[PDB]
Amino acid sequence: FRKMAFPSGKVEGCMVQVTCGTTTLNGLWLDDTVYCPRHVICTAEDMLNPNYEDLLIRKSNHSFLVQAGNVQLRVIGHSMQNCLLRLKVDTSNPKTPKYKFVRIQPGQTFSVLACYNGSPSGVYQCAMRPNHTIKGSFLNGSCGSVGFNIDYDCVSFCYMHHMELPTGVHAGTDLEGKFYGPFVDRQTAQAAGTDTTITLNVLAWLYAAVINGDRWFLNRFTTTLNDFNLVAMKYNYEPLTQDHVDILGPLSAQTGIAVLDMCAALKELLQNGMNGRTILGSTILEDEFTPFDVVRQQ
Amino acid sequence: GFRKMAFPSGKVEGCMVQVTCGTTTLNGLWLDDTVYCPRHVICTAEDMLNPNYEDLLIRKSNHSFLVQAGNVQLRVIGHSMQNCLLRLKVDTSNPKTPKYKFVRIQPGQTFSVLACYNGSPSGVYQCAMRPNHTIKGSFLNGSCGSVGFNIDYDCVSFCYMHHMELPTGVHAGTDLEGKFYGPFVDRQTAQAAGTDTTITLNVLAWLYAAVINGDRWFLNRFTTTLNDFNLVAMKYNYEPLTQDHVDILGPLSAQTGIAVLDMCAALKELLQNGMNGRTILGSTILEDEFTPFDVVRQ
Ligand SMILES: COc1cccc2[nH]c(C(=O)N[C@@H](CC(C)C)C(=O)N[C@@H](C[C@@H]3CCNC3=O)C(=O)c3nc4ccccc4s3)cc12
Ligand SMILES: COc1cccc2[nH]c(C(=O)N[C@@H](CC(C)C)C(=O)N[C@@H](C[C@@H]3CCNC3=O)C(=O)c3nc4ccccc4s3)cc12
């Protein structure tokens, strides 16, 4: 069982470089639109608070240097959408795939194409956390990198990188420029809400461990959903919904362990702890491996 | 802020095709006017237990190879075996052919895998060639012919093509010249690898990664000689350290400011006293699938 990313070629054909003054970041080229974080226009204005509507009226189309590989693209118009700029260019991307813009929900995963200077350097898998952060790997120059999923040749773009919190996690927006979480694009230290554990995915991981022949943690206690949810919240675990219990159906049928019986297993692990025991090799319960991942890889 | 990252797969995705002989369908790699694929695409369910490839191949003509690149079908105009691969000559040269080389990777080195099913890429992940010449991959039915690769600049270095899953769940395959890594043969039999060991040079590089990411709890005032460390390493199934390895860890040592043999003393302490419930870079186990080169790049 291992975390896999979606193949990145459909997105690589869209990455570009957007430069204002001495500041440059990544943008996404779809048809005749380039999307990028709006703070490419900042010149130290980012410190404290920038007035984006003022900075933007003060900018000409010629001040935007947009480069796709070797080619410079002429900016024909610009308008601001939330925390993103939409740049109109004179040529439509010959490599635009079928795409949509989606708002990823907590607990769901996506692939990140980390880019620097409009050039992709790496691909990895991420989870949107309940507190609306992601545990990414992003260095200076990463802003504008996108997260995405791919279904039947259609790219679902769900994220654009904007910032790294003081704790080392990362924050950003969907492709309409709406931030995930309560963060704002200014140069300030910001704090995320307490980060809860994705219970649906821990449970999925437990199911994967049982499929792997590792079942020391099972027991014969019973729990109701309500009584499991009250214990889980005491340990900063997300409560389980009835939809989540359904999502776990195929895995519970495959192993013969009823979902609520696995909850009774997890409940004991929360209350008694691992005690040095290991699950799939780790003393830590993994929560970024989804039931879909377990299902596909079993 | 540190994780396994795979190379962007775009240059490789544009080379994946589908090769069919009768009921059997495998992935193939299309470079210039040649398609490479595992030779047991010519196998029926009855030839698999102990087939004679020379015999089975003399019995086929170019017409019996249906090669599909996406929608398009390419005509085979010639064929030949190279070890455990077939090389099919096609009438059209792949216009998406990247700059490339064929290399044979040595144990401990890492690469990216593009997992393909029915000629179409489905996932990408990073993995390393184990000391016992297997890879700990994620390969399902229909994955044979998927390739492993590294990218330097704009040149794809192909190093792996996938053939088989051992009963232990690890995987075996060949370089692009069709020569298998390890003691394995392409037959439908249960085969065993040698006993695996831990890649010491990679654990050390990962410990440097942790120090560079601000995880220094495991460090200690002590130091050890290479010989002393090796005696300890042998006890815990770790590859012996070599002076060349220490030279490879030169640059990491300089940035960190920690002498290599100091890091070894820390590792000796982690082997002997465990991690005490502590985690390094978010992991409860000593990661050994990051090379010194990988840590630098990130
Ligand atoms: C340590 O806590 C802090 C305390 C006090 C202040 C702090 N600010 C930030 C913060 O993150 N600022 C944002 C930018 C703001 C405007 C959203 C930022 O630098 N984003 C990066 C990606 C970051 C960097 C490392 N990996 C992450 O992904 C991005 O490449 C961009 N670069 C530039 C460079 C020039 C112009 C625009 C951009 S936009 C953290 C922080
Ligand atoms: C007594 O038999 C066993 C006993 C104990 C363990 C065992 N392992 C294997 C074994 O691996 N066989 C090879 C094939 C051999 C001949 C190279 C095989 O099926 N490879 C797969 C990838 C495999 C499949 C599951 N995940 C892995 O990645 C592959 O994608 C290919 N598929 C086909 C399908 C039809 C025709 C050709 C090919 S080539 C057999 C076996």
Residue numbers in the entry:
A (entry chain B): 3 to 300
B (entry chain A): 2 to 299
From the paper:
The main protease (Mpro), also called 3CLpro (3C-like protease), represents an attractive antiviral drug target. Mpro is able to cleave pp1a and pp1ab at 11 sites, catalyzing the formation of a series of non-structural proteins critical for virus replication and transcription. In fact, a variety of studies previously demonstrated that only the dimeric form of Mpro exhibits enzymatic activity. Here, we showed that a peptidomimetic compound with benzothiazolyl ketone as warhead, YH-53, is an effective inhibitor of SARS-CoV-2, SARS-CoV, and MERS-CoV Mpros.
We also solved the crystal structures of YH-53 in complex with SARS-CoV and MERS-CoV Mpros at 2.04 Å and 1.99 Å resolutions, respectively. The SARS-CoV Mpro-YH-53 complex is crystallized in space group P1, while the MERS-CoV Mpro-YH-53 complex is crystallized in space group P212121. Compared overall, the SARS-CoV Mpro-YH-53 and MERS-CoV Mpro-YH-53 structures show high similarity with the SARS-CoV-2 Mpro-YH-53 structure, with the RMSD of equivalent Cɑ atoms being 1.040 Å and 1.322 Å, respectively. As in the case of the SARS-CoV-2 Mpro-YH-53 structure, ligands can be found in both protomer A and protomer B in the SARS-CoV Mpro-YH-53 and MERS-CoV Mpro-YH-53 structures. Particularly, YH-53 forms a C-S covalent bond with the catalytic cysteine residue of Mpros of SARS-CoV and MERS-CoV, and forms several hydrogen-bonding interactions with some conserved residues, as is the case with SARS-CoV-2 Mpro. The main differences for YH-53 interacting with Mpros of SARS-CoV-2, SARS-CoV, and MERS-CoV were observed at the P1′ and P3 subsites. In the SARS-CoV-YH-53 complex, the carbinol hydroxyl at the P1′ subsite forms an additional hydrogen-bonding interaction with the backbone NH of Ser144 when compared with SARS-CoV-2 Mpro-YH-53. Furthermore, the hydrogen bond between the methoxy group of YH-53 and Thr190 is impaired. According to a previous study, YH-53 showed an IC50 value of 0.74 µM against SARS-CoV Mpro, which together with the present study suggests that YH-53 is a broad-spectrum inhibitor against main protease of coronaviruses.
